[PDB]
Amino acid sequence: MQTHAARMRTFMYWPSSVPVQPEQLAAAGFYYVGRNDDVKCFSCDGGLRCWESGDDPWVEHAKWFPGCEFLIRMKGQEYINNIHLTH
Numbered sequence: 001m002q003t004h005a006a007r008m009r010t011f012m013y014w015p016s017s018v019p020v021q022p023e024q025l026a027a028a029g030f031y032y033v034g035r036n037d038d039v040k041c042f043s044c045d046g047g048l049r050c051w052e053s054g055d056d057p058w059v060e061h062a063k064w065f066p067g068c069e070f071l072i073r074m075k076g077q078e079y080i081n082n083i084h085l086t087h
């Protein structure tokens, strides 16, 4: 699941009603585990579920798993710091 393309392949049967969708999820390191709206990061193994209207997969990645190596080398530490400045 190291590549954006491989992670996308898991999202073929992502539920239609979820207000967050595969392109943003897979970009943020997530792949679909095949149950409900549950996804996991390929790097930190953090899982997220219960996605809401307005959620951004990067923000949620930084909110819950700020020590993720993938996240730090993609968005940088300042981005992560800013997420926690206001939550």
Ligand SMILES: [Zn+2]
Pocket (backbone or CB within 6 Å): 029, 041, 042, 043, 044, 045, 046, 061, 065, 068, 069, 070, 071
């Ligand atoms: Zn991660």
Ligand SMILES: [Zn+2]
Pocket (backbone or CB within 6 Å): 084, 087
């Ligand atoms: Zn915080």
